[PDB]
Amino acid sequence: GRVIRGQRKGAGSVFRAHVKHRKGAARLRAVDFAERHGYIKGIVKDIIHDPGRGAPLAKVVFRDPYRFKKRTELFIAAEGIHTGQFVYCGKKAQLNIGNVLPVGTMPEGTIVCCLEEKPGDRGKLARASGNYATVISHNPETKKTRVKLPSGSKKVISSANRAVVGVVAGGGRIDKPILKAGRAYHKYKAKRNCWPRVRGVAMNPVEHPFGGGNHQHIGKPSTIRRDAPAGRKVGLIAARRTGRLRGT
RNA sequence: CGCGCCGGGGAGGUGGAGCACGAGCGCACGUGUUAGGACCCGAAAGAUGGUGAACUAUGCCUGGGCAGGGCGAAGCCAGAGGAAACUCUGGUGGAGGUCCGUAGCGGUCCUGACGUGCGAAUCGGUCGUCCGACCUGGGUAUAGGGGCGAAAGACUAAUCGAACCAUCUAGUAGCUGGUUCCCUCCAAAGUUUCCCUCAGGAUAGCUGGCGCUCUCCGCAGUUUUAUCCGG
RNA sequence: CUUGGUGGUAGUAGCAAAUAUUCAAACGAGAACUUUGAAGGCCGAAGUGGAGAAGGGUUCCAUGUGAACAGCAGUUGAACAUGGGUCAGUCGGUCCUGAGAGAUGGGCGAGCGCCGUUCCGAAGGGACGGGCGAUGGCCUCCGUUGCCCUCAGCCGAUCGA
RNA sequence: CCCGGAGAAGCCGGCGGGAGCCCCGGGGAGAGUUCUCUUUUCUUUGUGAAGGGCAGGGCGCCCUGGAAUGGGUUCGCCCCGAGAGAGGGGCCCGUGCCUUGGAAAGCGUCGCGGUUCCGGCGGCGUCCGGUGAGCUCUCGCUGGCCCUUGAAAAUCCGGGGGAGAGGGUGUAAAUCUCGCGCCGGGCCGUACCCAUAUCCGCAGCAGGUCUCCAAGGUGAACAGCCUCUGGCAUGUUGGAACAAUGUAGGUAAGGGAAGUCGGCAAGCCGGAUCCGUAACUUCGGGAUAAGGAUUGGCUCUAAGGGCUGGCAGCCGACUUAGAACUGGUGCGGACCAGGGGAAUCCGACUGUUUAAUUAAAACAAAGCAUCGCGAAGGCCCGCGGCGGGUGUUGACGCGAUGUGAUUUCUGCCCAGUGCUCUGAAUGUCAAAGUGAAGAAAUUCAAUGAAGCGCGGGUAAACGGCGGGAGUAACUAUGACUCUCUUAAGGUAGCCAAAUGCCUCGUCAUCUAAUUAGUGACGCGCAUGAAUGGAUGAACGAGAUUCCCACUGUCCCUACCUACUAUCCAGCGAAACCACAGCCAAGGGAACGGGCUUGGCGGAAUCAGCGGGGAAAGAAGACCCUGUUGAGCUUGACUCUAGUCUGGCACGGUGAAGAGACGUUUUUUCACUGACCCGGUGAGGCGGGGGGGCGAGCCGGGCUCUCGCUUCUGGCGCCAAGCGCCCGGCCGGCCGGGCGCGACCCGCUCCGGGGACAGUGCCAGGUGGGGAGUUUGACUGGGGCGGUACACCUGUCAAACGGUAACGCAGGUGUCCUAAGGCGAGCUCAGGGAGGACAGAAACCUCCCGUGGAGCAGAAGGGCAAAAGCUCGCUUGAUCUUGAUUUUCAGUACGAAUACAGACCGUGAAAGCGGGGCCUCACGAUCCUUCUGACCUUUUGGGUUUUAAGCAGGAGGUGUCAGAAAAGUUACCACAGGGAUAACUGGCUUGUGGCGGCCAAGCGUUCAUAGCGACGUCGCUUUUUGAUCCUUCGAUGUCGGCUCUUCCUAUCAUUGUGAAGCAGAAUUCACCAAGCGUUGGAUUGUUCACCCACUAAUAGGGAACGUGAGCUGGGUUUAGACCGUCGUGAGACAGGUUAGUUUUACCCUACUGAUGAUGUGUUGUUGCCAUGGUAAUCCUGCUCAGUACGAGAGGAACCGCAGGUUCAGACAUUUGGUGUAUGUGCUUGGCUGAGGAGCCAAUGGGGCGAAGCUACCAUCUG
Ligand SMILES: */N=C(\N)N(C)CC[C@H](N)CC(=O)N[C@H]1C=C[C@H](n2ccc(N)nc2=O)O[C@@H]1C(=O)O
Ligand SMILES: [Mg+2]
Ligand SMILES: [Mg+2]
Ligand SMILES: [Mg+2]
Ligand SMILES: [Mg+2]
Ligand SMILES: [Mg+2]
Ligand SMILES: [Mg+2]
Ligand SMILES: [Mg+2]
Ligand SMILES: [Mg+2]
Ligand SMILES: [Mg+2]
Ligand SMILES: [Mg+2]
Ligand SMILES: [Mg+2]
Ligand SMILES: [Mg+2]
Ligand SMILES: [Mg+2]
Ligand SMILES: [Mg+2]
Ligand SMILES: [Mg+2]
Ligand SMILES: [Mg+2]
Ligand SMILES: [Mg+2]
Ligand SMILES: [Mg+2]
Ligand SMILES: [Mg+2]
Ligand SMILES: [Mg+2]
Ligand SMILES: [Mg+2]
Ligand SMILES: [Mg+2]
Ligand SMILES: [Mg+2]
Ligand SMILES: [Mg+2]
Ligand SMILES: [Mg+2]
Ligand SMILES: [Mg+2]
Ligand SMILES: [Mg+2]
Ligand SMILES: [Mg+2]
Ligand SMILES: [Mg+2]
Ligand SMILES: [Mg+2]
Ligand SMILES: [Mg+2]
Ligand SMILES: [Mg+2]
Ligand SMILES: [Mg+2]
Ligand SMILES: [Mg+2]
Ligand SMILES: [Mg+2]
Ligand SMILES: [Mg+2]
Ligand SMILES: [Mg+2]
Ligand SMILES: [Mg+2]
Ligand SMILES: [Mg+2]
Ligand SMILES: [Mg+2]
Ligand SMILES: [Mg+2]
Ligand SMILES: [Mg+2]
Ligand SMILES: [Mg+2]
Ligand SMILES: [Mg+2]
Ligand SMILES: [Mg+2]
Ligand SMILES: [Mg+2]
Ligand SMILES: [Mg+2]
Ligand SMILES: [Mg+2]
Ligand SMILES: [Mg+2]
Ligand SMILES: [Mg+2]
Ligand SMILES: [Mg+2]
Ligand SMILES: [Mg+2]
Ligand SMILES: [Mg+2]
Ligand SMILES: [Mg+2]
Ligand SMILES: [Mg+2]
Ligand SMILES: [Mg+2]
Ligand SMILES: [Mg+2]
Ligand SMILES: [Mg+2]
Ligand SMILES: [Mg+2]
Ligand SMILES: [Mg+2]
Ligand SMILES: [Mg+2]
Ligand SMILES: [Mg+2]
Ligand SMILES: [Mg+2]
Ligand SMILES: [Mg+2]
Ligand SMILES: [Mg+2]
Ligand SMILES: [Mg+2]
Ligand SMILES: [Mg+2]
Ligand SMILES: [Mg+2]
Ligand SMILES: [Mg+2]
Ligand SMILES: [Mg+2]
Ligand SMILES: [Mg+2]
Ligand SMILES: [Mg+2]
Ligand SMILES: [Mg+2]
Ligand SMILES: [Mg+2]
Ligand SMILES: [Mg+2]
Ligand SMILES: [Mg+2]
Ligand SMILES: [Mg+2]
Ligand SMILES: [Mg+2]
Ligand SMILES: [Mg+2]
Ligand SMILES: [Mg+2]
């Protein structure tokens, strides 16, 4: 009968992201002759805490090579970096933390972050707190590379694409228990309206397919098809298994 | 005229809204049955097009606001015992979804007052919390099978288990209710059969009115005499 | 049933939230309630005080009136009738942008129209100096229009406290 | 041009500085006080912005110098070779002080003129000091908090740069962010209220509505209480009374929850100091635990500080400890201000929630555990697009669920139903496409995607977790074993719990007494493991139970106060209303105000009162009917957006192979030009030279790299140089241009995909996410149950025929190749006597044999050379018109009967035969299908396929004269119904209750003292049932409380009879219902059971009396928890907890109160016809330790003394009350002090007159 929560979110308007105090987008430097052939120097002017994000950012100042004008970028901070540190970047960049070079050059077993999935997008994969990717093996023919991501999906990518060296800071966040409702409340106030998560079962049987009944119970099987209309797709999606996960 | 896989006749049964020396059309009047808003008045709902978040639901931007006391976390200072490890004793500091409690915020109980009320939800005394998921003003966003909900089917201008205004719309009713002058003459039924029929119809039955063909031989809710039947 | 009018019920129910009035004098036809004075009380700076906002829109002030209204009366009043009254470079709006709304280009749309706000756009009418041309002035020196050379990143029209 | 800054940031705490206010001590000017005191008490007692100076704070600023035997220093900190202490400096704020403004003005005072209309005019004064945990505002410093780190742009400014301009020793110049001097600053709002009377609520409505300011005292305090500044007349009126009923306030001897569903309400406790403080525990808490003592006034001592020259002297704050005295033991003196403990259940906590009946045990919440997904992606919106949100995002993330802190545990079951993985090993499987014959439409045939099947996996997916047998040396039980059924068969733990019917389970404790409560037991109707089980400190406006103290909650009521009600002056409604308003019985729609018959009846009126008027209220919400709906559900029916899958088109260019049906069907491998994606202010791409740093070869050939930047928080733009040109001036000057410097040529800006995704059109699938609709009838209420819904026999049927009930006894939805058709010939059931095996029963024979057997079936009728049984030949169970009968409307179907015309069968022949000996065994229109004629039409004519026609059978409608169809509503809605229930009322009385007759037996004996079987006759309507006449436009539905009267079927008392009666005690019966019949524990209970006294603890009605008389615990709304059932929405004469109880002023009625006619008027003292009616019972003494009786035991009558209950009065005494506001005391403030007083909603506490008044005092019956 009614339109349920899941559906009401898609139009948005209420659930859009709060973006007053966000500093900006965290994109890498754009491609150009210098990066493609040689290298370009750049200092770390300052570090900054971005809202809604575990990791911190960095005000990185470079110099524009064609016009007399200092550009600026917002890199994501690898661990161990500090202000007053010369950050090189390019093809001929030396291998040490805080230094952007294409993956192809570095050997196998190299740990990287802020990686591009396709060339030019200015850095999409692996840039949250405590993550890093592992370079497994190159492939001279076709000029492509094999890379295992933290989740485990191994992916091939063109060797040309870029990556900032080192892991992302802020690891071990999930270690501390979020003790009180308020401490959670503030977090989701920074990000989005989602926090107080009401169980569908409690609702009346208009607002949920599991609702109603005199006794609190679901009544029907909680596994469900993916060939299914919007409104029903609810519960455990395409559940291959469903139980106390013994072993791994 | 073309002759043949041509045409035409007779008798005898049977089906027909036919013949058998025509009787209709036009106009007016009455009654009766229908179709339409159709004897008058009456719905719960249905569809199309528009208007509202001045209360309230919730998110966001920019502003405002909350005495005085108790409890006394880490850190720090000092003294004492001790072989060492170290441990005991007294001060300081002022933490916290901490405690008593005011304004504010809320509104449990007395099932107290009032109950043609001061009031289409107020008053009294008694109650919970009061630095926090705290309280609040103005601006702004979301609109009806749609919005919004710490989820009660709550709320959406006193209206919500589908809002409000007009139009389609005099919407249908086997159901209640009402239905306007006199006299005279005649005068009933509630039973049969069929129906998604049992609060209803048709259909036979009962009733009236209009007449017409003959009358100054026929018929009867009856007996008698004969004659059968009856279980 | 509809509209309009009138009865009994009735000169009854009733005019009970938060302590409170009293004496003399004046105008006046008339005074429990008007005014002055005197005496006694209350609100007791989280105010029954002094100032503002939104909002109301002449209710502010004076003179006169006593029909109607102020659920008793009233010589009174926020009632009625006459007339008056709001003066800024410096106090605010006006300027700015904020969450956001909203044009243009572009696309969609039988269609009134709608999406979308930098996204598929030839998105500058500006400036200083040089040369050449053109006028106006005690043509001194300096203005006032034009071309050519040389230079220019924006960012999205516009509203929004 | 570039770089950079301000504008530009959160909350909280502490501390310091500066103002305003407050206070103190002296000075002046005027007021008030003076019975007595009082150098008294009160008011008042000033300098703006903008400039200059100086104070006064701050500084992460400089210089000198170099510290450990470490120093300085803050309440806390912190700081130091990255340069401390100690000197000298600098800067920043300067709302404070001085000054120009400015004493002329202003204010306070005294006095002169103007008669006046006057910013009138003159004296004087407007002083000097001190204080502070005080308050308020502000400036600054410094900490603490964050999975929260707390706005932008307009606008303004500084610096790095150095393109360029300027005059030749002067009246110098271009140029100045320096000091004066000139002009101008438009448009619009601007009054007032800003709220117990200017706003919104229909109004001058106790409601609601955002801010600033903010004195004295008491005190922890902005608490409460009183006063000044300022404001006001008690909030839409007054006077006279002071009764009951109310509303809000108080207090009570003795007792202390006994009242009651329940300690509901009120009351006790309350602040501080000093002692003291257990169980348990997540070791933080619990904790103001508990439990004690003190507290006043007045008069003293002592300890804590500043400033200048181990000291002195001058000043000033508030606190703390201590001591003596003194009072009628009063003292936190008013106000403000916590009742406690032991236990159990639930939920962890704080929070939120139904605006207007539910604040909870519901939700959330942290923790836990699953699932999808690496972007051409997941999830969703969207009518649409190369669209949009999450996304300024990227697996420690977004997204979808479940569970509910911690600790501890988390057993077995994948058969079912879901989900999912594998998919030629594969049954089925559409369009198009491909072969096949045919004149062609065609039809046939192969080929064949996903999906269903098939097979794996899965329970922190929905979910589930038996029974029978045998077995231990007492019985029991069953360790152990087997089997049936399913895929296992309840493991660990727990309980008559919020889950247990029977049930008040049983035992113990808790009570004198306990259906409650707590601890064990377990057979568990129906416990149980993240649909989570068990525990568990702290917390709860949560649910129950008990204990302490405490109380007018109760025995048991009384008194007082204010506001009313009451009477008066003024002003002034509405609901409601057929007529009206005294009763009993009677019959009547079965409870009448009117009727009949009886009883009766007297003006007009007041304050109260709640019995009635089936009172008002709202076209009954429960129930039923309705061919009336909505909300929701799913395995109902019929469809749909979306998503998955194949085909055709947009859609190219080449490579190799097999073959394929010079060609292809197709498998791979490329290319790119459509097309698609991403980035850029679309900035140096690919080739070819030349140049260089290195390796190898013979100035030369070849390959690759580079093209010049890695110790450091710097700067970096607007071209140097050269060559070649020339332009004006005069070999030199001034001003110009091009190209190298910075290689040349090109056709897509760079990359990645790419002929596939994709878009458009068809086709199959999936699809309660969504839409539309349906969800039979009869019915002794409906439902559940039957089918009496179409058929047939017998009876009921009352002697023609015809007749009903969910009446009776019963049957049917078939069977037959002959069990049909002719003819002939036989005669059955049963019994008797005989005969080897032979038998009660096997086979043969004679005799009897009216049918006693049989004819498929239900029963009934019918039949003997047959309708039975056996042989022989056959198929009239065929073709075809009409007529009639049965049901009946005298319409159909079916079923059958008489004839007729053909072809036949059989029998010698007359004949017989068109299905089953008779009475039941079955079906319309429309559509499809088959058969049938040299049949008709197929449209301008002709031929031939196909189709349509015509006639006769079949496929089926059993709700059987024929819609195609599942559930729920306690969230509910509408029309109506007493044609129809759940209470009452009526008639009946089975059942229940009571009572008679006969007398077989008990009672030793003796039937009948007392009882009475087998049988039998009656009454009653407080039980229960059966019925539906009344009311559904509403009669308020269970219990208790309170209160009156009434019945008698006598429990006790009075009088008397009879006993298997000696007395006592106890039994049965008559007259008799006037007077009595209790207090409590448990349960909502009526009922039940128990303790205690008694004379006795009998039974019942009146609308199951009694709701505008109460209460609202239970039933019986909405919220929620559990078990079982149901896949689910939901359900339960199965448990649990929270949940608006309306109006009286009418008529009558009763109560009390004025009054009325008549005697001519008026008093007076008096009379009684009528109504009403009252007393009750018990104890002791004596009689009497006697009569009686063996004794044990053991009375009665008259008298005497007292008591209970009830009724009627009074208030001498005791008690209560006490606002005579009578009188002492007293807390805080106010009147200068003393005295005398007042306010604090009765300020508080003592004692208390009068008067009212109590079995709580007394009297009489
Ligand atoms: N959903 C629940 N839990 N219940 C109890 C049903 C609620 C229904 N909707 C109301 C109701 O009361 N139903 C009753 C009402 C009466 C009716 N009934 C009563 C008496 C008699 N003799 N016969 C009846 O049929 O029964 C209904 C019932 O119990 O189902
Ligand atoms: Mg729907
Ligand atoms: Mg649903
Ligand atoms: Mg707290
Ligand atoms: Mg408290
Ligand atoms: Mg009440
Ligand atoms: Mg009102
Ligand atoms: Mg605002
Ligand atoms: Mg929408
Ligand atoms: Mg909320
Ligand atoms: Mg929410
Ligand atoms: Mg609910
Ligand atoms: Mg509900
Ligand atoms: Mg009409
Ligand atoms: Mg109508
Ligand atoms: Mg009716
Ligand atoms: Mg007979
Ligand atoms: Mg009265
Ligand atoms: Mg009166
Ligand atoms: Mg009032
Ligand atoms: Mg009053
Ligand atoms: Mg007061
Ligand atoms: Mg004012
Ligand atoms: Mg005025
Ligand atoms: Mg008056
Ligand atoms: Mg001016
Ligand atoms: Mg638009
Ligand atoms: Mg503007
Ligand atoms: Mg503004
Ligand atoms: Mg002065
Ligand atoms: Mg003003
Ligand atoms: Mg008001
Ligand atoms: Mg008023
Ligand atoms: Mg008054
Ligand atoms: Mg007492
Ligand atoms: Mg007492
Ligand atoms: Mg009792
Ligand atoms: Mg009680
Ligand atoms: Mg109480
Ligand atoms: Mg305790
Ligand atoms: Mg909770
Ligand atoms: Mg509510
Ligand atoms: Mg309530
Ligand atoms: Mg789960
Ligand atoms: Mg489990
Ligand atoms: Mg399975
Ligand atoms: Mg128990
Ligand atoms: Mg178990
Ligand atoms: Mg559960
Ligand atoms: Mg279970
Ligand atoms: Mg359970
Ligand atoms: Mg426990
Ligand atoms: Mg009056
Ligand atoms: Mg009547
Ligand atoms: Mg009455
Ligand atoms: Mg009544
Ligand atoms: Mg109704
Ligand atoms: Mg009705
Ligand atoms: Mg109907
Ligand atoms: Mg019907
Ligand atoms: Mg419907
Ligand atoms: Mg749908
Ligand atoms: Mg419809
Ligand atoms: Mg029926
Ligand atoms: Mg007969
Ligand atoms: Mg007969
Ligand atoms: Mg024949
Ligand atoms: Mg036969
Ligand atoms: Mg038809
Ligand atoms: Mg039919
Ligand atoms: Mg009987
Ligand atoms: Mg005998
Ligand atoms: Mg009836
Ligand atoms: Mg009635
Ligand atoms: Mg009534
Ligand atoms: Mg008698
Ligand atoms: Mg009754
Ligand atoms: Mg009532
Ligand atoms: Mg009553
Ligand atoms: Mg109940
Ligand atoms: Mg189930």
Ligand SMILES: [Mg+2]
């Ligand atoms: Mg008498």
Ligand SMILES: [Mg+2]
């Ligand atoms: Mg004797």
Ligand SMILES: [Mg+2]
């Ligand atoms: Mg006395």
Ligand SMILES: [Mg+2]
């Ligand atoms: Mg007294």
Ligand SMILES: [Mg+2]
């Ligand atoms: Mg004195």
Ligand SMILES: [Mg+2]
């Ligand atoms: Mg006394």
